[PDB]
Amino acid sequence: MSEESQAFQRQLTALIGYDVTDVSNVHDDELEFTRRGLVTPRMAEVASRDPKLYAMHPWVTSKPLPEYLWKKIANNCIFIVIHRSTTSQTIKVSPDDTPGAILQSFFTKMAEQDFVLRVCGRDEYLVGETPIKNFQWVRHCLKNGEEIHVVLDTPPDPALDEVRKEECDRKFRVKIRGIDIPVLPRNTDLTVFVEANIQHGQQVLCQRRTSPKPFTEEVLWNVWLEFSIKIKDLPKGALLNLQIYCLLYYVNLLLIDHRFLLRRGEYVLHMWQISGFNADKLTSATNPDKENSMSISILLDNYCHPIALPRAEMPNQLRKQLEAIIATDPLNPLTAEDKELLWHFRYESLKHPKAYPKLFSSVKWGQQEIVAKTYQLLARREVWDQSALDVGLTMQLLDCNFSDENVRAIAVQKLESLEDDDVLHYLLQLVQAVKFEPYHDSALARFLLKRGLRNKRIGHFLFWFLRSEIAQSRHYQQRFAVILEAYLRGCGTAMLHDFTQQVQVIEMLQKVTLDIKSLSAEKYDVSSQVISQLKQKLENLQNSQLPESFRVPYDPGLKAGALAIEKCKVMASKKKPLWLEFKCADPTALSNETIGIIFKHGDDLRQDMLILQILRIMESIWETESLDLCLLPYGCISTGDKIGMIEIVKDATTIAKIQQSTVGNTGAFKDEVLNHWLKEKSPTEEKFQAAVERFVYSCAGYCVATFVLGIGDRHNDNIMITETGNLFHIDFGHERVPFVLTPDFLFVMGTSGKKTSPHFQKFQDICVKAYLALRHHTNLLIILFSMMLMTGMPQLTSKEDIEYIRDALTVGKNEEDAKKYFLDQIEVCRDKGWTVQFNWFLHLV
Ligand SMILES: Cc1c(CN2CCN(C(=O)[C@H](C)O)CC2)sc2c(N3CCOCC3)nc(-c3cnc(N)nc3)nc12
Numbered sequence: 080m081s082e083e084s085q086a087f088q089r090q091l092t093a094l095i096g097y098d099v100t101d102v103s104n105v106h107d108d109e110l111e112f113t114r115r116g117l118v119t120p121r122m123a124e125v126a127s128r129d130p131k132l133y134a135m136h137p138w139v140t141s142k143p144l145p146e147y148l149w150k151k152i153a154n155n156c157i158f159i160v161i162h163r164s165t166t167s168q169t170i171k172v173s174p175d176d177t178p179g180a181i182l183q184s185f186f187t188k189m190a191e192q193d194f195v196l197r198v199c200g201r202d203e204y205l206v207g208e209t210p211i212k213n214f215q216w217v218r219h220c221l222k223n224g225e226e227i228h229v230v231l232d233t234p235p236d237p238a239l240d241e242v243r244k245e246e247c248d249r250k251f252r253v254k255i256r257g258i259d260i261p262v263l264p265r266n267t268d269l270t271v272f273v274e275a276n277i278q279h280g281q282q283v284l285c286q287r288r289t290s291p292k293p294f295t296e297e298v299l300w301n302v303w304l305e306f307s308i309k310i311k312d313l314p315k316g317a318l319l320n321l322q323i324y325c326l327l328y329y330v331n332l333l334l335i336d337h338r339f340l341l342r343r344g345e346y347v348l349h350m351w352q353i354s355g356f357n358a359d360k361l362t363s364a365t366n367p368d369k370e371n372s373m374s375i376s377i378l379l380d381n382y383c384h385p386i387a388l389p390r391a392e393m394p395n396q397l398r399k400q401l402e403a404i405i406a407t408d409p410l411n412p413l414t415a416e417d418k419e420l421l422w423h424f425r426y427e428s429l430k431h432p433k434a435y436p437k438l439f440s441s442v443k444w445g446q447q448e449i450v451a452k453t454y455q456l457l458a459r460r461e462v463w464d465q466s467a468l469d470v471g472l473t474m475q476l477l478d479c480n481f482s483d484e485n486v487r488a489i490a491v492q493k494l495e496s497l498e499d500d501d502v503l504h505y506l507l508q509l510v511q512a513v514k515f516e517p518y519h520d521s522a523l524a525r526f527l528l529k530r531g532l533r534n535k536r537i538g539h540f541l542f543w544f545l546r547s548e549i550a551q552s553r554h555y556q557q558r559f560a561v562i563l564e565a566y567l568r569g570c571g572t573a574m575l576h577d578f579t580q581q582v583q584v585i586e587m588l589q590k591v592t593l594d595i596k597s598l599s600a601e602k603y604d605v606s607s608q609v610i611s612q613l614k615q616k617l618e619n620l621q622n623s624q625l626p627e628s629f630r631v632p633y634d635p636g637l638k639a640g641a642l643a644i645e646k647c648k649v650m651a652s653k654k655k656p657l658w659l660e661f662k663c664a665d666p667t668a669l670s671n672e673t674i675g676i677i678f679k680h681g682d683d684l685r686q687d688m689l690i691l692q693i694l695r696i697m698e699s700i701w702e703t704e705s706l707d708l709c710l711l712p713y714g715c716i717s718t719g720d721k722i723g724m725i726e727i728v729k730d731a732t733t734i735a736k737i738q739q740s741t742v743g744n745t746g747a748f749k750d751e752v753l754n755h756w757l758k759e760k761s762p763t764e765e766k767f768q769a770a771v772e773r774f775v776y777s778c779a780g781y782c783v784a785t786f787v788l789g790i791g792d793r794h795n796d797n798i799m800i801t802e803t804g805n806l807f808h809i810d811f812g813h814e815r816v817p818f819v820l821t822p823d824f825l826f827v828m829g830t831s832g833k834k835t836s837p838h839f840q841k842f843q844d845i846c847v848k849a850y851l852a853l854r855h856h857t858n859l860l861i862i863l864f865s866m867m868l869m870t871g872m873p874q875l876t877s878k879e880d881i882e883y884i885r886d887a888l889t890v891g892k893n894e895e896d897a898k899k900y901f902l903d904q905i906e907v908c909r910d911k912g913w914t915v916q917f918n919w920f921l922h923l924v
Pocket of ligand 1: 648649679809810
C-alpha cells in the first residue's frame, strides 16, 4: 500500500480507539473479509449523495406540526429575524414557505441568488425544499416560545467533504481435546467439565458434555462429542457454544462460516470469564488476553459445502386460537401446541405482520427441510412489504431470538423506509442490535453504514455510539471497529477533521478527570489544594495543546470555543467529576452564554445514554398524539470505561438543596419551600405563572416515563428543576413509591395533603393522557426495554427483569382500568408523603 495510505490508517486507529489491521486475536478471516465487503456499500453511498445537501445537513421531518405547536401560531404567520450581521430585518412568513421562497422574498422586501440561512450560533442550515414548518430548529423555538434568528451567509464548500480514493448425511461431531489455563486460584478444588451446545437464536438445538475430571491447569479428554443433528441440518449462523462449569467460562465458534463453508481444522479458543441472558454471551469473538485466560483445544472434521437454494382455510375456532396467540405481548412464551398451530398454518400467519416474530419462533431451524419451506414462505412477502412500518415489530426481528439472515434482513428492509428524523430516534438501539447478528457483515450493519454516510447528523452520532462500545467492549469491539472504519472512509475530510478535534479534547480532559479523582477521596470535600491544580492543569491545556474549537458530541450543531477557566470547578459528587464551561466558538452566536459540560468517572454512562434515548422516544410518541410533557433528556455521551460527558442544563438546581433553602445538612422536608424557590426565581408574575405551568407538564412527564421504566423511586438528590419551572431527572446508573410526587410538588400544584385544585386536576388528567398514549406503543416499549437490558445492563433475568415493565404498562387491561391504575399510583404517592425521601441517609452511617 502507499506510505501515505499507512499514515492514513494510523489516523483511522486514533479516531477508532482500536487497531483493525491487527490480526493477533482472530482464528479466521471474517473481520478482514468484512472490511473488504463493506467497501462497496461505503463507495455506493458516497457516490449517490448530493454533495451540496450533504454539506449542509438540513435537519427535517415529514410529520404534521403537532397541535400544541400550531396554536402557538395564531396567525398563519411566522417571524424570521434575518441578520446580515449589522442590521437585521424581521419577516412575516407563511408556514408553507420554502427557504428559497424566503430568500426570494427577502431581496424583494429590501426596498447573488446563491446565499443561505443559518441558525445564529449553530452549524444548522435552513435549506432545501421543505416547508420551514418542517425544520427541527424551528419547531424547537415554537415549543420553547423562542425567536427564530438566522444570519445570511454563503454555502459551505463540498470540496471540504472530499473523500480520499480507495483500495453430508453424517451426524455432527466435535472432538474436545482439553482445556489449558495458566492459573486457577479460587478456594475449593473441584471437578470441571465442558458443555457443548449447538445454538441458533438463543435456541439450543443439541447439547452434549464431557466426563467431569479434577480441576488442573491442564485437562485433557481427547473425546469425540457426537451430536444428534446431521451436518446438512446445520442452519447458517449456528453457534458452537462451549461452556465450563463446576458456569465459569464460555466461548463461541460459528459452525458455518462467512463463505457458507462448514468449519474444519484445529481450534484453540480463549474464553470469557464470569462474575458471580446477556448479549455478550453470543459473541463470535475470542478473549484477546492470551496470557491470563482459559483456553480450549478442540477438533473439527467433516465435508465442505452445505448451501441455500430458491389452499385450506381454517375453521373459525382454530383461526380464533391463532388470533389469540398473535395478539399477546412480545414477552409471552409459545407452547409446543402454540408453535405447531402457528407453523401448520404458516400461510395464514403470513397475512398478519404482527405474527412474524412468533411464527419465526415456531420454526425448527435444525431441519433443512423446514428452513427451506421457511424461505419458500418468505419468497411471497406481499403482505409484509406493503405493511405500515412497525418499528417495534421490525425491532423484534433484530433481537437475540433470531439468527436467520433472511428473517433479519426483512426487518432491515422495512427500516429502509425510515427517514433521518426517525433513524436518529432509534440509532442507539439499532447499533446495539448489531450485537445479535451472527456475522460481522450484516444487512443491518450495512444499513447503519449507509444512513451514517448519507447524513452528517446520523454520521456524527453513529461515530460516537460505535466508539463508545469499541472502547468498552472486548466482546464486540472488533466488529464495531470494522464498521466504524468503514464509515470514516466515507464521511469526508471535513468530519474527519471535526472528530479528531473532538477526540483530542476528550482525551485531554478525560485525563484530567481521572487524575483529579485519584488525588482526592470522599469526605466528600473539595481541598483548596485540589482546586488550584484543577486550574493549573486546565490553563496549560488551553495554551499548550488546544484544538482551537470543537463540536459538542451530544450537540453537533454547536462548536465549543475556548474554556472559561474561571467558571470551571471540580464537583462535590462522590466521584469528583469536572464541571467545565466553554465560550461558544461562533461569534455570530446570539447569546453571551457559555457551554457547560460535565466530565465524570465512575458511572456507566452507557446505561444513561440508553435511558436518555428511551426518554427521547416517549417524547416522540407523545408528539404524534399531540402531547408535550416538557422532558429534559439532556445530552450524555459514554466514551471510556465508566466514563463519558454530560450536558449541563442551565439554571437548574437540585430539588434536594431547594429543600436546603432554609437549613440543609441533615434531612427532613418542608412544604411550600419549592413554590418559594419559584416566586423568588421569577422576574415577573407572568413568568411565575408560566413556571408553575411548565412544572406541571414536566412533572407529569417524569412521573409517567419513570414509572414505566421502573426507575421511578429516586432520591430527591437526583431530581432537578430549572429557574423556569422545568423539572428533570438525572444520574441514571441504577418500601417503594411508584414515582416521586411530594407535598412540595403538590403544594406548587396548589394542594397540601388530601384535597384537589385546578392545577392538580390538570396534572392527573395529563398523566392519564400521557400514560394511555404510551400503552398504544407497549410492544415498542417492551422490545426497547428488553434489548436495553441485554445489551446495556450486566447479566439480567431475560425472564424476570424484563417483566417489571409488563406489569407496569398494564398489559391486557382496557384503557379504563388503566386510567384508574395510574390514578391510584398518584394516591399511593400522596400517602407516602415524605416517608420515602426521608429514608435515604439512614444507612449512610
Ligand atoms: C450532583 C449534580 C449536581 C449538583 N451539584 C451541586 C454542587 N455543585 C457545585 O459545583 C457546588 C459549587 O459545590 C455541583 C452540582 S447538578 C448535576 C447534573 N446536571 C448538571 C446540570 O445539567 C443537568 C445535569 N448531573 C449529574 C449527573 C452525574 N452523573 C450522571 N451519570 N448523570 C448526571 N449530577 C449533578
